């Protein structure tokens, strides 16, 4: 959840520099929603690397 | 206010740590710090709500 800000264009960070970056002149819409109940388990849903 | 001087600062390690909830630079970019030579640095520490 903390990385949602880095998704915005013109950002930086490990997410913005190692796995996903948006262009400076990005044109489009970004949509997000929590999926804790959908894709999280008490033992640790490590499927998301 | 602790003074910093007569040293070499590798700001990359500070910025790469995710333990920081906020890392905002207002006159410089955190990436550019690594290549930038300063006069004096004032490191001020406090605890706030």
- Distance (Å, whole) CA A47 – CA A44: 9
Contacts of B30 in chain A (CB under 8 A): 12
- Find where tokens 């044109």 sit: A27
B18 at A interface, C-beta within 8 A: yes
- With beta carbons less than 8 A apart as the criterion, state whether B43 and B2 touch: yes
- Cα four-point dihedral sign A41, A37, B21, B47: negative
Give the other-Cβ count within 10 Å of B45's Cβ.
Answer: 6
**Resolution, angstroms, 1 dp:** 2.3
Report the structure determination method: cryo-EM
d(CA B5, CA B19): 25
A12 contacts in chain B (CB < 8 Å): 29-31
Query: Which residues make Cβ contacts (< 8 Å) with residue B28, sequence separation at least 6?
Result: B36
- A12:B16 CB<8 A: no
Could you write out the three-class secondary structure of chain A?
A: CCCHHHHCCCCCCHHHHHHCCCCCCCCCCCCCCCCCCCCCCCCCCCCCC
H or E element that contains B4 = strand B2-4
CA within 13 Å, CB half, B45:
4
Helix (H, G, I), strand (E, B) or coil at A17: helix
Q: Which of residues 2-31 of A touch B (CB under 8 A)?
A: 2, 12, 14
């Amino acid at each position: 959840g903390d990385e949602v800000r880095q998704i915005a264009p013109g950002q930086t960070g490990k997410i913005a520099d190692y796995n996903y970056k948006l262009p400076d002149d990005f044109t489009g819409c970004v949509i997000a929603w929590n999926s804790n109940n959908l894709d999280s388990k008490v033992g640790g849903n490590y499927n998301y690397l | 206010r602790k003074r910093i001087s007569n040293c070499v600062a590798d700001y990359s390690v500070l910025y790469n740590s995710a333990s920081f909830s906020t890392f905002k630079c207002y006159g410089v970019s955190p990436t550019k710090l690594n290549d930038l030579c300063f006069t004096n640095v004032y490191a001020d520490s406090f605890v706030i709500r």
